């Protein structure tokens, strides 16, 4: 089975190994599309304490294709990790980062106490809002929240609050108050052709042997030998007159190999009459002595 060279990997490294994460009130989103779904760095990172999927099991996620994958990146407290899920309520689930209750995808989180703390007040969350968020809504307004009946007129005061509060993230905080880096990978399948598929490894290509072949999406057989054909830059394989693949351009080498059938032919016994001799010779018709 032959696959093309694996290039243009999906930027999971950039999302998970990021220098900085956004505040939960203003979570970042990166679009992942038209790339290879290489999750090997997420298979056993050791550092991930939380790994749960609402879409499909992670052991199938690596094979099946999607049209779009979105990476939502933010920092929350350890006790807030519970809220990054379908069916949840709370200050994060309702005012900072809302998932669909029918959400498909995976939530991954890890302790970042040695990365995102010192206090580190660069991480903020929404404490006040008039109503909750819609799924994947990002409310980054700084307008003063009016809790009372008296107009705030743009400033804080009695029953008037700045809607975004900072976290006192410190290296000496208890675990529930330490910062955690959360990446949510939102996965969808549309009517559109899927573009984000898992990587597949190629089998060593062997010439001059009778083999079952699979080149990209084309199933073949027979024996491959060096071709003297020149294909146009966009062509992947060629054909003979009777709807038969004649040659294939290999996905990795860009070399073309001709396809011959595995040797076959009738078997004939050449004999004198049994009246004078029981000695026989055997003729393998239309084949090579190296195949018999």
């Amino acid at each position, epitope marked *: 089975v032959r696959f093309p060279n694996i290039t243009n990997l999906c930027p999971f490294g950039e999302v998970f190994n990021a220098t900085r994460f956004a505040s939960v009130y203003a979570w970042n989103r990166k679009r992942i599309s038209n790339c290879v779904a290489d999750y090997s760095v997420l298979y*056993n990172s050791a550092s991930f304490s939380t790994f749960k*999927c609402y879409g499909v099991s992670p*052991t199938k996620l690596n094979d099946l294709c999607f049209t779009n994958v979105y990476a939502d990146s933010f920092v929350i407290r350890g006790d807030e990790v519970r809220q990054i899920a379908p069916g949840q309520t709370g200050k994060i689930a309702d005012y900072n980062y809302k998932l669909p209750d029918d959400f498909t995808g995976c939530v991954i989180a890890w302790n970042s106490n040695n990365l995102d703390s010192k206090g580190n007040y660069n991480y903020l969350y929404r404490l006040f809002r008039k109503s909750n968020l819609k799924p994947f809504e990002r409310d980054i307004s700084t307008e003063i929240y009016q809790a009372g009946s008296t107009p705030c007129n743009g400033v804080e005061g009695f029953n008037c609050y700045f809607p975004l509060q900072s976290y006192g993230f410190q290296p000496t905080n208890g675990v529930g108050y330490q910062p955690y880096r959360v990446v949510v990978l939102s996965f969808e399948l549309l009517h559109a052709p899927a573009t984000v598929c898992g990587p597949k490894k190629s089998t060593n290509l062997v010439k001059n042997k009778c083999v079952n072949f699979n080149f990209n999406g084309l199933t073949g057989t027979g024996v491959l030998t060096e071709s003297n054909k020149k294909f146009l830059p966009f062509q992947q394989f060629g054909r003979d007159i009777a709807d038969t693949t004649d040659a294939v351009r290999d996905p990795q080498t860009l070399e073309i190999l001709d396809i011959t059938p595995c040797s076959f032919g009738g078997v004939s016994v050449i004999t004198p009459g049994t009246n004078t001799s029981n000695q026989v010779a055997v003729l393998y018709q239309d084949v090579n002595c190296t195949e018999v």
Partner: antibody
Framework: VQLVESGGGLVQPGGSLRLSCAASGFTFSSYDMHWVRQTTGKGLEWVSTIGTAGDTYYPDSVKGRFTISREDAKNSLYLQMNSLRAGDTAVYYC??????????????WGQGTLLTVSS | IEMTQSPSSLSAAVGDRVTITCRASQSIGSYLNWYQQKPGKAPKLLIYAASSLQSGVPSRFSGSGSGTDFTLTISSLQPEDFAIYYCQQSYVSPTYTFGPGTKVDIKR
């Protein structure tokens, strides 16, 4: 398809047990293998999994105590359970997972083996 | 996610229709599996993905449901269907969990 558990027996609290499961009738290397346990008074619980990519997952009560491994060359599944507690007494089973589209289910189980933890 | 089954014990005669319900603490879409475990035996898969019947499962078995409320149905209970039945949420992986189980007894 057949699945046969072994390695069950008596262990003290604070000790360890090594379980195994023989895989036959299927391409073991192509399937996600799981362990589950059935505890009297609680019902059937999932314990661990190992994928074909070598990835592993555990529930929070197990993380850090149990290690799951597989030897594809021998069609044999293993679970090394250390730091055992009395609450780990259960019948442990090996199982094969499978799927249809985006839906996952368990399809095959062995007969299970009983693990008893007591001083 | 937690699953609750009802009744904990179902009493029905051979030939009776048997219905077992399972409720999710939150929506699980159509991601629910059902299993049948005979005494002294490991569980068998009956229904997966809410309503898909598994091969090898008698046509007497069917079921449906979505969101939080699901039901398994046996059109006509047989003596061999004396078993403990379980529902399993499959929405949240890797931590697959089962409900408390419904024991189906033969009514006399």
């Amino acid at each position: 398809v057949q699945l046969v558990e072994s390695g069950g027996g008596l262990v003290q609290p604070g000790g360890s047990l090594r379980l195994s499961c023989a895989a036959s009738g299927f391409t073991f290397s192509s399937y996600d293998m799981h362990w589950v346990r059935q505890t009297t008074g609680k019902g059937l619980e999932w314990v661990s999994t190992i994928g074909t990519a070598g990835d592993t997952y555990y529930p929070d009560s197990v993380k850090g105590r149990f290690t799951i491994s597989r030897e594809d060359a021998k069609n044999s599944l293993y679970l090394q359970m250390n730091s055992l507690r009395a609450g780990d007494t259960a019948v442990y089973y090996c199982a094969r997972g499978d799927s249809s589209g985006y839906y996952y289910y368990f399809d095959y189980w062995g007969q299970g083996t009983l693990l008893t933890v007591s001083s | 996610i937690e699953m609750t089954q009802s009744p904990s014990s179902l009493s029905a005669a051979v030939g009776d229709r048997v219905t077992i319900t399972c409720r999710a603490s939150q929506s699980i879409g159509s991601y629910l599996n059902w299993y049948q475990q005979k005494p002294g035996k490991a569980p068998k898969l009956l229904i997966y993905a809410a309503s898909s019947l598994q091969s090898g499962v008698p046509s007497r078995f069917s079921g449906s449901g979505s969101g939080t409320d699901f039901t398994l149905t046996i059109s006509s209970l047989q003596p061999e269907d004396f078993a403990i039945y379980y529902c399993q949420q499959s929405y949240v992986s890797p931590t697959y969990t089962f409900g408390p189980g419904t024991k189906v007894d033969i009514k006399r």
